[PDB]
Coordinates of C-alpha atoms and ligand atoms in Angstrom, one line a residue:
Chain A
X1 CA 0.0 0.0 0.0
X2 CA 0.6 3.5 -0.4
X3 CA 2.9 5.5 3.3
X4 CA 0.6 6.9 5.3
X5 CA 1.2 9.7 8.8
X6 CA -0.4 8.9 11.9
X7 CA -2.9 11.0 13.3
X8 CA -4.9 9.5 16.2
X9 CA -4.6 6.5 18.1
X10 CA -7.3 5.7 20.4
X11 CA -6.9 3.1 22.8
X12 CA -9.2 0.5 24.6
X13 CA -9.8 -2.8 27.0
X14 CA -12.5 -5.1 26.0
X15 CA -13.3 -8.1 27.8
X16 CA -15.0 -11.9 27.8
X17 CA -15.6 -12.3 31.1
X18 CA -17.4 -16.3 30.3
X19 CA -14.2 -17.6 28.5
X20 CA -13.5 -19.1 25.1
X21 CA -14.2 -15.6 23.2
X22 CA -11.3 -13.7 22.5
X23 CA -13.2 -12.4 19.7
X24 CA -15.6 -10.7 22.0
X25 CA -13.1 -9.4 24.5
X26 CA -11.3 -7.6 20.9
X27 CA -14.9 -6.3 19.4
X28 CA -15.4 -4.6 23.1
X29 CA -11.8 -3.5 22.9
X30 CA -12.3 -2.0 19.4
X31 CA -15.7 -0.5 20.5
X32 CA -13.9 1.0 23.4
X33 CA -11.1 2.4 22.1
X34 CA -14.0 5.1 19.8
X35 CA -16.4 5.2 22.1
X36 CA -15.8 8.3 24.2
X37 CA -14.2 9.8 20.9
X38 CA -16.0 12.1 18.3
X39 CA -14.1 13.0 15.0
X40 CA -16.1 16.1 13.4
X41 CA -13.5 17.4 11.1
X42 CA -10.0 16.4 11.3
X43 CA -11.2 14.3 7.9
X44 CA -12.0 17.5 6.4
X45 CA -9.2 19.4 7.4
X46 CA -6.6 16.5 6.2
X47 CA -8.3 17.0 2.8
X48 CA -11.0 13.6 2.3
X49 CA -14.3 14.1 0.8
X50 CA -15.8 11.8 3.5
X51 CA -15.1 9.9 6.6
X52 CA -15.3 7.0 4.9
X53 CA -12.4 7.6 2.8
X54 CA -10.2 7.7 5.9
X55 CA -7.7 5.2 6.6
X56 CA -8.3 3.1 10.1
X57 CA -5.5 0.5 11.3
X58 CA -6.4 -1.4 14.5
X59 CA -4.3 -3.6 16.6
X60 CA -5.4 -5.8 18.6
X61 CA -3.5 -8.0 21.8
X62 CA -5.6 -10.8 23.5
X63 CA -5.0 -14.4 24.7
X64 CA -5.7 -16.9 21.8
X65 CA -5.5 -14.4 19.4
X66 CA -5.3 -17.3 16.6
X67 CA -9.5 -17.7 17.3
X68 CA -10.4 -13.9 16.8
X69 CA -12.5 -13.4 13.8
X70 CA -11.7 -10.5 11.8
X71 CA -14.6 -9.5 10.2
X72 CA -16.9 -9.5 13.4
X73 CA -14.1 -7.1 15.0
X74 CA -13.6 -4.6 12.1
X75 CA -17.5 -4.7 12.0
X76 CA -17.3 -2.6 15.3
X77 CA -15.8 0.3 13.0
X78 CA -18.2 2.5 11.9
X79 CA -16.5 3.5 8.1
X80 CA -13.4 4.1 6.8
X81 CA -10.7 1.7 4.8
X82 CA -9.9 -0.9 7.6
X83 CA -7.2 -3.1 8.6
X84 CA -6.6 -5.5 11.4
X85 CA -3.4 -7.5 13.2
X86 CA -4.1 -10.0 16.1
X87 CA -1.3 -10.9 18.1
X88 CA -0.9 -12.2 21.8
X89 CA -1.0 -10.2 24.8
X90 CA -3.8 -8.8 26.7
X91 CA -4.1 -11.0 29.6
X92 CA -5.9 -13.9 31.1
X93 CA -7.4 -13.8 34.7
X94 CA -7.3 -17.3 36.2
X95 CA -10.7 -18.2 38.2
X96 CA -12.6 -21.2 39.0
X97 CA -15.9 -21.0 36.4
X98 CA -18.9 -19.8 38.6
X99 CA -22.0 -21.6 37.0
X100 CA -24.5 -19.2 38.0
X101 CA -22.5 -16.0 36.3
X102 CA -23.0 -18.4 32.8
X103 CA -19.0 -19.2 32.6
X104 CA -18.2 -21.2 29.9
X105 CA -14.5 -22.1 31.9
X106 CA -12.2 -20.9 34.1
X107 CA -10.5 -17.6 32.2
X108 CA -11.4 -14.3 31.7
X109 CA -10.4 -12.7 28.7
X110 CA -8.9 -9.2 28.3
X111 CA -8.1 -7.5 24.9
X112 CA -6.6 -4.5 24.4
X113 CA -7.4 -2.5 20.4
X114 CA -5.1 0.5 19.3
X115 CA -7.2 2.3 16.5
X116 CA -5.1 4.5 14.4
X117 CA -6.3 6.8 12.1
X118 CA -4.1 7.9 9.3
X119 CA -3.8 10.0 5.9
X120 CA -2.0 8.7 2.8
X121 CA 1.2 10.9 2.2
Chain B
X1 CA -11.4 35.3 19.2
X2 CA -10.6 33.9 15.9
X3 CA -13.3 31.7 14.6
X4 CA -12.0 28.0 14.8
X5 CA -13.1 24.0 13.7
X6 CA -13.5 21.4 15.7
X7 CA -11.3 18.9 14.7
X8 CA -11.5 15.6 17.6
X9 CA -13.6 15.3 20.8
X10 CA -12.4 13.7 23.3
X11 CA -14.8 12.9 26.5
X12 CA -14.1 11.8 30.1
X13 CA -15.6 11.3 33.6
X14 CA -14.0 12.4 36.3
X15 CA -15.1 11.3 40.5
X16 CA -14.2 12.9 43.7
X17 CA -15.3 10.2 46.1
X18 CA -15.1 12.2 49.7
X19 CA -17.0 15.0 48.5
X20 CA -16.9 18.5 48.6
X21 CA -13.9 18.9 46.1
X22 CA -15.4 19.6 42.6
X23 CA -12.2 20.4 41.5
X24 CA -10.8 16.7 41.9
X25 CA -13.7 15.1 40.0
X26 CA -12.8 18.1 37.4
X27 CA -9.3 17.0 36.9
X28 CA -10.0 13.5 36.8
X29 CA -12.3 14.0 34.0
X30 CA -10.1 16.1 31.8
X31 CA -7.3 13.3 32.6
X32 CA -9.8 10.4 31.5
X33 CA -10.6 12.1 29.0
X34 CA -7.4 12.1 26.9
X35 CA -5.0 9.3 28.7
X36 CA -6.3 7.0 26.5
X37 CA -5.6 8.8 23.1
X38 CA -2.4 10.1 21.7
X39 CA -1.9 12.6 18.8
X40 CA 1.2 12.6 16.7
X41 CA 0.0 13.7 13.5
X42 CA -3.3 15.8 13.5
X43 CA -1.7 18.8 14.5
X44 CA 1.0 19.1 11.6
X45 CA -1.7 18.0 9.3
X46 CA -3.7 20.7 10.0
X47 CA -0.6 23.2 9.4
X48 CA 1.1 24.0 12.9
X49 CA 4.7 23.5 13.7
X50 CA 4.4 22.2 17.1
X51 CA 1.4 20.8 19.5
X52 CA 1.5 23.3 21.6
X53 CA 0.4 25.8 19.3
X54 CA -3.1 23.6 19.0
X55 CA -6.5 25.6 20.0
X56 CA -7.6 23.2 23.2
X57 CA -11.5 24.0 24.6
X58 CA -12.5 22.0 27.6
X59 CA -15.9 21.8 28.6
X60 CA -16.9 20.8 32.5
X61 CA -20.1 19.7 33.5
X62 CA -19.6 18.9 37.3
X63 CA -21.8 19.8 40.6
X64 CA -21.1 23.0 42.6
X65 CA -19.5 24.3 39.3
X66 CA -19.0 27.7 40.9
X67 CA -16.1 25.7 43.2
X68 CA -13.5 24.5 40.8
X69 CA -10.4 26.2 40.4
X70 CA -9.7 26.7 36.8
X71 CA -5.9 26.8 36.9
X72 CA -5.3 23.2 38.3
X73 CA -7.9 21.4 36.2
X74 CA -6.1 23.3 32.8
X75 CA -2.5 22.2 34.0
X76 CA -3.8 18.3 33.6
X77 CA -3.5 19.6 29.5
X78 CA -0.2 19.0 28.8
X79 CA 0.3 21.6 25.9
X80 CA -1.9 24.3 23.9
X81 CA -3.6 27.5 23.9
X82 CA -6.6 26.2 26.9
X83 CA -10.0 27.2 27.6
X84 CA -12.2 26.4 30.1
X85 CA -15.9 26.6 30.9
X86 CA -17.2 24.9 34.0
X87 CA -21.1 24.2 34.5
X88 CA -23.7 22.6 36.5
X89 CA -24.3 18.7 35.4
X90 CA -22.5 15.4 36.3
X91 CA -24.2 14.3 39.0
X92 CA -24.0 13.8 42.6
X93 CA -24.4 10.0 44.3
X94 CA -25.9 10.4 48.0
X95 CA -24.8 8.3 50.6
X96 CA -23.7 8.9 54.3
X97 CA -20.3 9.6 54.8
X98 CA -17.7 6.5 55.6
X99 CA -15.0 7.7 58.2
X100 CA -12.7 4.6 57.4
X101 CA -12.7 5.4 54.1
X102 CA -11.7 8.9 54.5
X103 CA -15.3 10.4 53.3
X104 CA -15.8 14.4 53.7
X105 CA -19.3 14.4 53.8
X106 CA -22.1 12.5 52.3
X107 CA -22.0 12.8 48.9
X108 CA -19.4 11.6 45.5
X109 CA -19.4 14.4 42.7
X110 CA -19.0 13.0 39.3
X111 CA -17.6 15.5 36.9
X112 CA -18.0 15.0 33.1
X113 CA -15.1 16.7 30.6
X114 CA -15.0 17.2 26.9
X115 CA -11.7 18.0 25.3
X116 CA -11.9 19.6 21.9
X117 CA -8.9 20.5 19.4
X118 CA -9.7 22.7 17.3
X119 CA -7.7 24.7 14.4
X120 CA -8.0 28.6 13.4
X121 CA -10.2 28.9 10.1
Chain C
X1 CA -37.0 5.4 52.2
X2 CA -35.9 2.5 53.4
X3 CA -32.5 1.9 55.2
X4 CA -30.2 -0.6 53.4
X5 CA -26.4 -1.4 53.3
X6 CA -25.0 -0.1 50.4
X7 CA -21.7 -2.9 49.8
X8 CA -20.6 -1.7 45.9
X9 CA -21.2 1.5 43.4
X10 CA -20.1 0.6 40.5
X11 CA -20.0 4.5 37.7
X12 CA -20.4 4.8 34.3
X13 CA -20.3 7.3 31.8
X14 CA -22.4 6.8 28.1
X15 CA -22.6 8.7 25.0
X16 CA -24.8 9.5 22.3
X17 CA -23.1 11.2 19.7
X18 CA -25.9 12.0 17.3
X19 CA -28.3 13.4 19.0
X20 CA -31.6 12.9 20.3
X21 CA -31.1 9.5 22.3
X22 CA -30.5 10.1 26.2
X23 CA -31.7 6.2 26.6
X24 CA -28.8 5.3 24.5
X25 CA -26.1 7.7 26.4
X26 CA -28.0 5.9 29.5
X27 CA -27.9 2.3 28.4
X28 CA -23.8 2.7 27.4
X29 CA -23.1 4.6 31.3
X30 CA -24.5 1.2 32.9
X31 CA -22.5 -0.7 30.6
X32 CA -19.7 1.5 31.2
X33 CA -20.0 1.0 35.0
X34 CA -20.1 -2.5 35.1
X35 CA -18.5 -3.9 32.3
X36 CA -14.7 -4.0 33.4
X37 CA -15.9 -5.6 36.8
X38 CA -16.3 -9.2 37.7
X39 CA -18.4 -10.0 40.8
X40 CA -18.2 -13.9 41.4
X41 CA -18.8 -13.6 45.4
X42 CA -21.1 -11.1 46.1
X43 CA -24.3 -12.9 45.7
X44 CA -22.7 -15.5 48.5
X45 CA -20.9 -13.1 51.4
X46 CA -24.3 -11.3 50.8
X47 CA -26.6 -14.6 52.2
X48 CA -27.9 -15.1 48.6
X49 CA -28.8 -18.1 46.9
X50 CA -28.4 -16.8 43.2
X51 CA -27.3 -13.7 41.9
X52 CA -30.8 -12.6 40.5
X53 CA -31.8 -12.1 43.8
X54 CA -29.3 -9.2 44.4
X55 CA -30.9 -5.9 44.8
X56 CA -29.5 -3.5 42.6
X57 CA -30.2 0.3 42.2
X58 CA -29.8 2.4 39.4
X59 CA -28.7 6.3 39.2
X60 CA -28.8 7.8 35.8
X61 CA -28.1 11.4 35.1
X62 CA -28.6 12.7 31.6
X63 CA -29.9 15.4 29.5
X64 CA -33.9 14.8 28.4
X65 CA -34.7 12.0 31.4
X66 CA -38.2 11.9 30.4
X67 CA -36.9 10.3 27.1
X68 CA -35.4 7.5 28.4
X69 CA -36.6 4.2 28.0
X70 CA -35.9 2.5 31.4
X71 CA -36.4 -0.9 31.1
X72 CA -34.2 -0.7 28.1
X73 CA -31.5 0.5 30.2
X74 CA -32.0 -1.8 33.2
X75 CA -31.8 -5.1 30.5
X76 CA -27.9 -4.0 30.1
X77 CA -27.5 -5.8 33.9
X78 CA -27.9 -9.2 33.8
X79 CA -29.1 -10.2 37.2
X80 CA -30.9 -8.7 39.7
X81 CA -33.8 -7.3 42.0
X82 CA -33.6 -3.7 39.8
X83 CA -34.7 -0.2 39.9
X84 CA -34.0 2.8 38.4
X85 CA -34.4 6.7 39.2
X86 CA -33.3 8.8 36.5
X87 CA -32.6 13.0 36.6
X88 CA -31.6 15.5 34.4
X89 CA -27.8 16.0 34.5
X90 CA -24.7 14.4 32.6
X91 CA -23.8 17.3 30.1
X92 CA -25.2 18.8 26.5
X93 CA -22.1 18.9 24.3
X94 CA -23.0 21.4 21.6
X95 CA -21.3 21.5 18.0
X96 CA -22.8 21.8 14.2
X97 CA -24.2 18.7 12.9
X98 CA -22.2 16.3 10.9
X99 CA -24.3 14.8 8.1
X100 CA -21.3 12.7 7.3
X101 CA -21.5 11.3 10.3
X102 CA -25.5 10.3 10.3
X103 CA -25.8 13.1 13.2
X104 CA -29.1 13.5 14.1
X105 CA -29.4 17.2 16.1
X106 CA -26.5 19.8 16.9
X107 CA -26.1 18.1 20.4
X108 CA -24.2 15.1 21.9
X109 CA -25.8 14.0 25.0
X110 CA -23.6 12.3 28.0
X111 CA -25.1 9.9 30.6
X112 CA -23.6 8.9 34.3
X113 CA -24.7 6.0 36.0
X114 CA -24.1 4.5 39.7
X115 CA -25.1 1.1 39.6
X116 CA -25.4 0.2 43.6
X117 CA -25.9 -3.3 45.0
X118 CA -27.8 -3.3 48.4
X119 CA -27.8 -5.8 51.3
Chain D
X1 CA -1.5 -21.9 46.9
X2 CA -3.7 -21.3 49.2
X3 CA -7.5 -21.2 48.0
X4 CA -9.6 -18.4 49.3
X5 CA -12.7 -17.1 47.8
X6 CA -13.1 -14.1 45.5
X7 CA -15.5 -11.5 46.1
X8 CA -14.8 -9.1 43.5
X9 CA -12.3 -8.6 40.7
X10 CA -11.9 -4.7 39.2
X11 CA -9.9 -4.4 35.7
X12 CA -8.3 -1.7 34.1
X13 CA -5.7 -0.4 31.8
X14 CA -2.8 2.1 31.6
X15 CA -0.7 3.5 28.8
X16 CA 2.8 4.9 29.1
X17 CA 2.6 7.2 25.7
X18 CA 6.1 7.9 25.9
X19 CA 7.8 5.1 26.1
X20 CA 10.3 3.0 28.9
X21 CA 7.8 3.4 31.8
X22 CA 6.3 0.1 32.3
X23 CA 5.5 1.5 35.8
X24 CA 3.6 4.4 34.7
X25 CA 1.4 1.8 32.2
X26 CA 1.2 -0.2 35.3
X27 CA 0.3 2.2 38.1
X28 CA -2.3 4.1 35.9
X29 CA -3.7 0.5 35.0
X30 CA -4.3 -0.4 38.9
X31 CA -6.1 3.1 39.2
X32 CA -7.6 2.8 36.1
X33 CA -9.3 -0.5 37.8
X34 CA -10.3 1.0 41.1
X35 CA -11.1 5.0 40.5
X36 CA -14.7 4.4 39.5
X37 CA -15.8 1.9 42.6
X38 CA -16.5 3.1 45.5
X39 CA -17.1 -0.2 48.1
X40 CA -18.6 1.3 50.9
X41 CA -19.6 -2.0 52.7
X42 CA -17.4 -5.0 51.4
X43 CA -15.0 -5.1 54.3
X44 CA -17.8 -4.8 56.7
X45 CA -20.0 -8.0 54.9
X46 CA -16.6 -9.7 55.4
X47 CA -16.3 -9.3 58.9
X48 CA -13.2 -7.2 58.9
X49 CA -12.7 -4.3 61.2
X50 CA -11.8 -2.0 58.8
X51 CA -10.9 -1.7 55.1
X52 CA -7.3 -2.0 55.3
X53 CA -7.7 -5.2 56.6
X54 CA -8.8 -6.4 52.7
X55 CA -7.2 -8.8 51.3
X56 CA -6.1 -7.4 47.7
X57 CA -4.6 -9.6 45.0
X58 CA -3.0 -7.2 41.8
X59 CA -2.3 -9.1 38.5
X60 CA -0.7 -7.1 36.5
X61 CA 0.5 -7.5 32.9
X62 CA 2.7 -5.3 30.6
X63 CA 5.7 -5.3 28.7
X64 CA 9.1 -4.8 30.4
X65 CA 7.7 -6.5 33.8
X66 CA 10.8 -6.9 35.1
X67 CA 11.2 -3.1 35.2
X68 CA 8.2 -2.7 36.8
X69 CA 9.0 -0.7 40.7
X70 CA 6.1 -3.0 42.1
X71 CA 6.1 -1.0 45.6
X72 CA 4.8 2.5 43.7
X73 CA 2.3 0.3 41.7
X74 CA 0.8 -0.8 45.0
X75 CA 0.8 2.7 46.3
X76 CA -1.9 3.6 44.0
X77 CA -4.5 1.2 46.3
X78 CA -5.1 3.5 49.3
X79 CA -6.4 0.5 51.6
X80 CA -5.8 -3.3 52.1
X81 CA -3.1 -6.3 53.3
X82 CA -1.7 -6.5 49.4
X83 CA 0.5 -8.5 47.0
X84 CA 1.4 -8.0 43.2
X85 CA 1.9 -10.6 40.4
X86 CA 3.7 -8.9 37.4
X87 CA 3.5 -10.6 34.2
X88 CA 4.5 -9.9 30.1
X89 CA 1.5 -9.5 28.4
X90 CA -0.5 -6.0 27.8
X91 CA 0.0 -4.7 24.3
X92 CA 3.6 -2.5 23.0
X93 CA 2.5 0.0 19.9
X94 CA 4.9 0.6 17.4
X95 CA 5.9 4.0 15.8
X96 CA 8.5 6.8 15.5
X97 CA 8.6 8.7 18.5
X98 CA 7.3 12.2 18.4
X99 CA 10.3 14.8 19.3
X100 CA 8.0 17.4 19.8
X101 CA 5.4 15.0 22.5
X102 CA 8.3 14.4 24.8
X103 CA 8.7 11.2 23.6
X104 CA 11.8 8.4 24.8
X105 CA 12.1 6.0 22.5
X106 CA 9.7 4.5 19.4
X107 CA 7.0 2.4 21.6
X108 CA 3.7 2.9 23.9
X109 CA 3.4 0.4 26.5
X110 CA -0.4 -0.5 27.7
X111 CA -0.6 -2.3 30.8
X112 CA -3.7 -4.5 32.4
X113 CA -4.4 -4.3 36.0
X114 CA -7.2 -7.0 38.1
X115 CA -7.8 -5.8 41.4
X116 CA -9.2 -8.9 43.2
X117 CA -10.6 -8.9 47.0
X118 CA -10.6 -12.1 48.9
X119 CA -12.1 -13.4 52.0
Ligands
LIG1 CL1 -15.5 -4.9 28.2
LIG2 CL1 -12.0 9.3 38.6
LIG3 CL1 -20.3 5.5 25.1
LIG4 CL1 -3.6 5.7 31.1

């Protein structure tokens, strides 16, 4: 692809707090990261017709990153021309699977999304 | 002034859990509100030769409004040309005063901040 | 009212960026609030035989109460003996609409919530 | 170890923008976890005399944990009987560091805090 400048990078925690998602814990992380966010104009002023046309890398860390499925996480993105890596981190919180909370085992599952907005150069 | 565009909003809650110190939940807020985002590109996008130059607005919606000190919640900004309005909202949680836990009186003030960056038209 | 042990306040702030939905801003603060916390033992130091018998109470600040939907917002928790009182407050932030951006009105409302479980 | 059970469990997350602070990442994580709680009653439901009797478990991960000053990380916990478990794991962003943001060096390290309280 074409070198592109970073503008923004919003950052975010997610979390599957049943087990067995990672995928969950990363769209939460995703959804996070923009949520308390609100991007009226630097679009305009960096020269796109549209939101749309921006350019949004996210980056996402969680446990078992090998079982996140892309397309439900970049799904969390509003517009724009999106990209995702998965790679391990985030962390896992050990815990005996409480039946009545609907566990599915005994981890919790914590993601952490870095969504980066750039321009083409 | 200058009229100016908004370019990113950044939001933030901010809690002062002994009461009586608006200010506190203030700060917090305004900290929340940008510790999760980092900007290493918008600003020379939009044409200025360092952040510190960027137009900053911060917007407080906290209780007693009349009691925060404007200096120390603009010093949590860590660079720009700041502005500050402060006005009644958040919200106040009731609930009698816990001497172990170090409680002023009986209520929590929750302060809510919105960071804007904006650039001179 | 009635005198009862407050044990855990869990705070929340939502959003609605477009305008025009407090119950939404309202719905994300109790998300917000309890979403990052994990309460496996509560239900049991408490003398309770399930969680869905905690009692929980609900704060919500926000512009435009009357607009909110409440039982909407109360489904965000999934257990519990629930109510919810809801009062103007949060904050209005005020900007041009972004038709780019599917806004709806010039105004994006924020919501607070306090999501208290009671003994 | 020993098994004792878990009442509740508070999670966070911290960012050192400018790079070489796993600390910072890690300290702001832990407050991160706690700052919008408030548990008036938990120590009382669990029979202890007062709060800083609690019994607080911190699992923290990051990169760099073995620069981690785990003493200031606990600081940030103003009550409780309390240990630290520092692990790699969080999330390191990549990219040229910003002269004019103060930066040290070319990464952002994002640490994850759990705040657990046992009985
Ligand atoms: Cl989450
Ligand atoms: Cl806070
Ligand atoms: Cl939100
Ligand atoms: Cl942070």
């Amino acid at each position: 692809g074409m070198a592109r400048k970073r503008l923004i990078i919003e950052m975010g925690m997610g979390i599957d707090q049943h087990g067995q998602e990672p995928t969950i814990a990363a769209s939460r992380a995703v959804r996070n990261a923009i949520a308390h966010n609100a991007l009226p104009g630097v679009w305009e002023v960096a020269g796109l017709s549209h939101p749309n046309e921006m350019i949004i890398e996210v980056q996402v860390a969680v446990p078992y990153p090998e079982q996140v499925r892309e397309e439900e996480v970049l799904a969390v993105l509003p517009f724009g021309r999106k990209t995702l890596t998965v790679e391990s981190g985030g962390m896992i919180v050990q815990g005996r699977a409480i039946p009545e909370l609907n566990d599915k085992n005994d981890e919790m599952l914590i993601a952490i999304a870095a969504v980066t907005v750039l321009i083409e150069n």
